[PDB]
């Protein structure tokens, strides 16, 4: 899931430990971390999608 | 909704100036006289009830 | 529509003057109408003018009775009929004022309509007797870490909040209201404090922000804000704490507990000064009227922890006094200090030095203190007082060759000081206060870097929430710390501290 | 009484006709409904990417 995405990401940090030359480990990590965090805060931010015509 | 509340307030001030006009109407007519008579007799009855 | 509401009200006018005592203004100056008539009148009675002004009758003199107008001068003029309401100042009281922002009179300034008030009770009601009180043993938790441990506050207590001018004095107060939400939500009415904030002289914009902040934290549903704003008249301002106290009395009388925060009595003094001088009563110290002590004491002794005869009920109080340039020798502060059973003394340097709460716990004292402190928290923070005391002495060692013992103290003290910071408008639960303090007490945090103290707290809390929310719950329900719990707590602390 | 009469007369005899929806429209925010979050183009196409990644990557330790 998302826990896999980050687990494999950080796994690659400790793999890059064993195979230095990381310059795009950070680009992979940054991009997935960012956009994963963007969608979750979006989905929690989400306005009710209807116009409240009940009360208002 | 904000304008709806505003329209209620505007309605209230509009309806206020109509009262000023009606006040001028009451004090103009010999309702001005006749209601003083009504008050007079009303006070007589009331003041007797004391 | 609105018109229909008006027709009903207009139908509701049919009253007639059936009163054998009236007055006619003789001269009106300074909001001190001096009225000719009113031969038989009860003292401080509420009186209604022709211009619909309401007043109280502070001076009953042999020839004239000097009403003080609650209204504006322009309205009143000579000769005006002065109807006698015949009721000494009384304001509606009941459970209805919960979640109601009301002006002093009792009218909703939040327009939530007529108060659900089961009585209108007079504003002067003498203080509970010697025998109607019992010793305090019920804590109240402000959620501010330093306050709850260093200056523990009970219930039905007097305890000053004397500090620097609008340096979020109000912020410190509001925080208490927020932490009380947690207990309030709790069903038992021993866990329900119905808080009352008495906003004196505070501008309507300021009180609007307060209202907004409270509404955001949904505190309105046990909160009452008696509002006497900057614009509100000096008689209303004078009677505003007295009126407020009466609202509190209903809850207390019903046997419940509640907390009334008089903010700030310094402005109450000025309003009374305005009245007194205008009523030509002799001036007194610091140009304040002489019986200002009698008033302030009278107000503050209507807060008490009532005996079990009186059904255990109470009205905790927390007066707020604003220091006029830190002059604590000033007449109004000195008086209040004597009356209060403890004071909390906020220092400007601390505020500037980013310590928020900026409470200087050096000169903060509570005379009831640890009597109504959580047992768990009492155990784990006697030491904390002593450590901090040393930290103060070893403060001056901040500037070369310096004993290791002092340096150890200094480190421990700084980490503790950082630990007791609590960002404004965030309260905390006691069950999460005690673990954090335990670590500091055991000096685990001495090792922890100052910068990492902030990170540590939340992390330790998260560690506790996952790993040992059994401990948190045990602390919560047992309310005491036992050697077995402290054993487990020490282990948990070690494990987290290691990471 | 006469007070009631005065009101009754005023209300009854003086009736407003409420303002148009158009006048209200000016005094309220109108509403323009945002349409489409846009569909981006497929990123890093061709074997330009495939070749780029295979060839570029070789940076590993000794």
From Swiss-Prot, chain A:
Coiled-coil stretches noted in the UniProt entry, renumbered to this chain: none
Subunit-structure text: F-type ATPases have 2 components, CF(1) - the catalytic core - and CF(0) - the membrane proton channel. In yeast, the dimeric form of ATP synthase consists of 17 polypeptides: alpha, beta, gamma, delta, epsilon, 4 (B), 5 (OSCP), 6 (A), 8, 9 (C), d, E (Tim11), f, g, h, i/j and k.
Name of protein: ATP synthase subunit d, mitochondrial
Misc note: Present with 6820 molecules/cell in log phase SD medium.
Protein family per UniProt: Belongs to the ATPase d subunit family.
Complete-protein stretch covered: 4 to 59 of 174
Function text: Mitochondrial membrane ATP synthase (F(1)F(0) ATP synthase or Complex V) produces ATP from ADP in the presence of a proton gradient across the membrane which is generated by electron transport complexes of the respiratory chain. F-type ATPases consist of two structural domains, F(1) - containing the extramembraneous catalytic core, and F(0) - containing the membrane proton channel, linked together by a central stalk and a peripheral stalk. During catalysis, ATP synthesis in the catalytic domain of F(1) is coupled via a rotary mechanism of the central stalk subunits to proton translocation.
Compartments in which it is found: Mitochondrion; Mitochondrion inner membrane
Gene that encodes it: ATP7
UniProtKB/Swiss-Prot annotation, chain B:
Organism: Saccharomyces cerevisiae (strain ATCC 204508 / S288c) (Baker's yeast)
Functional description taken from the UniProt entry: Mitochondrial membrane ATP synthase (F(1)F(0) ATP synthase or Complex V) produces ATP from ADP in the presence of a proton gradient across the membrane which is generated by electron transport complexes of the respiratory chain. F-type ATPases consist of two structural domains, F(1) - containing the extramembraneous catalytic core, and F(0) - containing the membrane proton channel, linked together by a central stalk and a peripheral stalk. During catalysis, ATP synthesis in the catalytic domain of F(1) is coupled via a rotary mechanism of the central stalk subunits to proton translocation.
Protein's name in the database: ATP synthase subunit 4, mitochondrial
Further information: Present with 12900 molecules/cell in log phase SD medium.
Localization per record: Mitochondrion; Mitochondrion inner membrane
Self-association state and partner proteins as the record states: F-type ATPases have 2 components, CF(1) - the catalytic core - and CF(0) - the membrane proton channel. In yeast, the dimeric form of ATP synthase consists of 17 polypeptides: alpha, beta, gamma, delta, epsilon, 4 (B), 5 (OSCP), 6 (A), 8, 9 (C), d, E (Tim11), f, g, h, i/j and k.
Stretch of the intact protein here: 193 to 242 of 244
Lineage top rank: taxon: Eukaryota
Family the entry assigns: Belongs to the eukaryotic ATPase B chain family.
Swiss-Prot record, chain C:
An individual GO BP term: proton motive force-driven ATP synthesis
Molecular functions (GO terms): ADP binding; ATP binding; proton-transporting ATP synthase activity, rotational mechanism
Record's keyword terms, sorted: ATP synthesis, ATP-binding, CF(1), Hydrogen ion transport, Ion transport, Membrane, Mitochondrion, Mitochondrion inner membrane, Nucleotide-binding, Phosphoprotein, Transit peptide, Transport
Something else known: Present with 41500 molecules/cell in log phase SD medium.
UniProt cross-references to NCBIfam families, sorted A to Z: atpA (TIGR00962), PRK13343.1 (NF009884)
Self-association and partners: F-type ATPases have 2 components, CF(1) - the catalytic core - and CF(0) - the membrane proton channel. CF(1) has five subunits: alpha(3), beta(3), gamma(1), delta(1), epsilon(1). CF(0) has three main subunits: a, b and c.
UniProt-recorded name of the protein: ATP synthase subunit alpha, mitochondrial
Organism: Saccharomyces cerevisiae (strain ATCC 204508 / S288c)
Gene designation: ATP1
Swiss-Prot record, chain D:
Protein origin, superkingdom: Eukaryota
Keyword terms of this UniProt record: ATP synthesis, CF(0), Hydrogen ion transport, Ion transport, Membrane, Mitochondrion, Mitochondrion inner membrane, Transit peptide, Transport
GO cellular component labels: mitochondrial inner membrane; mitochondrion; proton-transporting ATP synthase complex
Signal peptide (from-to): none
Localization per record: Mitochondrion; Mitochondrion inner membrane
Biological process, per Gene Ontology: cristae formation; mitochondrial proton-transporting ATP synthase complex assembly; proton motive force-driven ATP synthesis; proton transmembrane transport
Chief location category: mitochondrion
Other observations noted: Present with 6140 molecules/cell in log phase SD medium.
Family in the record: Belongs to the ATPase h subunit family.
Biological role stated in the UniProt entry: Mitochondrial membrane ATP synthase (F(1)F(0) ATP synthase or Complex V) produces ATP from ADP in the presence of a proton gradient across the membrane which is generated by electron transport complexes of the respiratory chain. F-type ATPases consist of two structural domains, F(1) - containing the extramembraneous catalytic core and F(0) - containing the membrane proton channel, linked together by a central stalk and a peripheral stalk. During catalysis, ATP synthesis in the catalytic domain of F(1) is coupled via a rotary mechanism of the central stalk subunits to proton translocation.
Name of the protein: ATP synthase subunit H, mitochondrial
